[PDB]
């Protein structure tokens, strides 16, 4: 068994973490267990604290706007490890007890209970080279030695490790995605009828996505092209929450549909990161540091939870758009569009033990 360790620049206090990936179950989040190793000789009268904070970054690292920091703290938890606080009566995890047994008597445990229904670790892709710091939600465990919390702490006396709060695909598949849209232009005849569906709701990263398109064009308007695209929606929730949109994959076929006819076809799409390196603000999965990441997994939320959850909430949809040729007595190059949306889930399969 191996555990992660990090030491302060002065090398006096070091903190031990069993793992750096914490699974976010909908009902509860896995506890953040760890042990900090200190020494009474260095700390004459100070008390060491461990703080777990959730940092959300609004914009670029440089302020350049009245000198204010675009960095919100969505959740901050604090605990006094040494001396052992008689206030908290939390038990000891088996990993924590093993760490205490392995380390000396100068090792003290800390545990964090992350409340449920919080944003996961998501980082926004900066696209072209503009900034040196990432932008997004992340979690970090910091342990520092100080006299009291309301005090500036030197960077030489504090450790800090980024941790990931991740979610995995649900063990059971859901209802098959399906969308329908009927449209008539000038009440000529029976309306155009578009039907689209996906083979399954939950897809994993790198798997192809099969879109079953079925069109019965009963009107007199010919369909020029059919465009299938996968779009990533990032609910960047804040004061006056907004919506970010980005086409991750696309396929614009030239399959025409004649009036009073039908056309059924299956289009296979695959969202991957090779062709999406130039899209600024694309939600990534948010690893520890600059490393191999992928498209951010769809955020799972409780159906009976609060809607105004700050951070980034990632979701994916498949848009099937038919561009119909427009023109009657006067022949122009204008066109109309009939589109449907098929929401699906993009996650990682649960690791097998």
């Amino acid at each position, epitope marked *: 068994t*191996r555990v992660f360790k990090k030491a302060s620049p002065n090398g006096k206090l070091t903190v031990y973490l069993g793992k750096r990936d914490f699974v976010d179950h909908i009902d509860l989040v896995e506890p953040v267990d760890g042990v900090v190793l200190v020494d009474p000789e260095y700390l004459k009268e100070r008390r060491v604290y461990v703080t777990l904070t959730c940092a959300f970054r609004y914009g670029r690292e440089d302020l350049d706007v009245l000198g204010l920091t675009f960095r919100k703290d969505l959740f901050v938890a604090n605990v006094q490890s040494f001396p052992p606080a008689p206030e908290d009566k939390k038990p000891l995890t088996r990993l924590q007890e093993r760490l205490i047994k392995k380390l000396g008597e100068h090792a003290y445990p800390f545990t964090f209970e992350i409340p449920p229904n919080l944003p996961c670790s998501v980082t926004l892709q900066p696209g072209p080279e503009d900034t040196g710091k990432a932008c997004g939600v992340d979690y970090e465990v910091k342990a520092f030695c100080a006299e009291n919390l309301e005090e500036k702490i030197h960077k030489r006396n504090s450790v800090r490790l980024v941790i990931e709060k991740v979610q995995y695909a649900p063990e059971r598949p859901g209802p098959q995605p399906t969308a329908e849209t009927t449209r008539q232009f000038l009440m000529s005849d029976k309306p155009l009828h578009l039907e689209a569906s996906l083979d399954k709701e939950i897809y*994993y*990263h*790198g*798997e*192809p996505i099969s879109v079953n398109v079925h069109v019965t064009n009963n009107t007199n308007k010919t369909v020029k092209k059919i465009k299938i695209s996968v779009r990533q929606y990032a609910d960047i929730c804040l004061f006056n929450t907004a919506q970010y949109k980005c086409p991750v994959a696309m396929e614009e076929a030239d399959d025409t549909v004649a009036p009073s006819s039908t056309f059924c076809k299956v289009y296979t799409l*695959t969202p*991957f*990161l*090779a*062709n999406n390196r130039e899209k600024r603000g694309l939600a990534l999965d948010g690893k520890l540091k600059h490393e*191999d990441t*992928n498209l951010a997994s769809s955020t799972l939320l409780r159906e009976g939870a609060n809607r105004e959850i700050l951070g980034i909430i990632v979701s994916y949809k498949v848009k099937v758009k038919l561009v119909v040729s427009r023109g009657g007595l006067l022949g122009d190059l204008a066109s109309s569009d009939v589109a449907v949306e098929l929401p699906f889930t993009l996650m*990682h399969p649960k*690791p097998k033990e």
Partner: antibody
Amino acid sequence: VQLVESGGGLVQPGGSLRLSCAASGFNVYSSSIHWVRQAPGKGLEWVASISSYYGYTYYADSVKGRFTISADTSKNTAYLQMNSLRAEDTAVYYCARSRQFWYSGLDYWGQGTLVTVSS
Amino acid sequence: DIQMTQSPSSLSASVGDRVTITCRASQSVSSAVAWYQQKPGKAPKLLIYSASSLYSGVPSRFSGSRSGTDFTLTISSLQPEDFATYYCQQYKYVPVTFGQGTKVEIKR
């Protein structure tokens, strides 16, 4: 679930050859493709690798500039163009598959095709 | 570049005996060590990954472990079908480097 290799044979020093590795049952984006060669009476040596999810491409220090690996995602096949085939390239080339996300070893390996570059 | 020292280069055991194969890494790889088995005239077959996790379909008699930069593959009860060449790879950094290869033969 299967990897099939083809395109190996007798080559002359300085010639060119192209190996094809057709992947059946795997997705080229959810899995990375690796090429490992085994010299006659020797051990395994990694040659090249391609990651279609990221577009990354790696080669061994002894094959850089000469060997080129690519992938045709439509047919789920990977190609390895080998230019300036030196005499030390006599080996059996295996095409292997590993999970693109959270690499966990070479799960599937092909039967391998012998490439002889004798003059 | 990391060079893995697989020892011994060749050993002779019998059916039912316990066999240990050692693999030492030059640099420090965390757990990215995999063990493969190759029979003469056949492609290699993955046996263990992450230096401790057993691959699906591999008999339970194979077992891996790590002690610092010293990895070990252990066969509790050698079988007549478990006599082949075993390699030791390290996929922590690119390039991925394999071991020299340990060849297991029957003892007489």
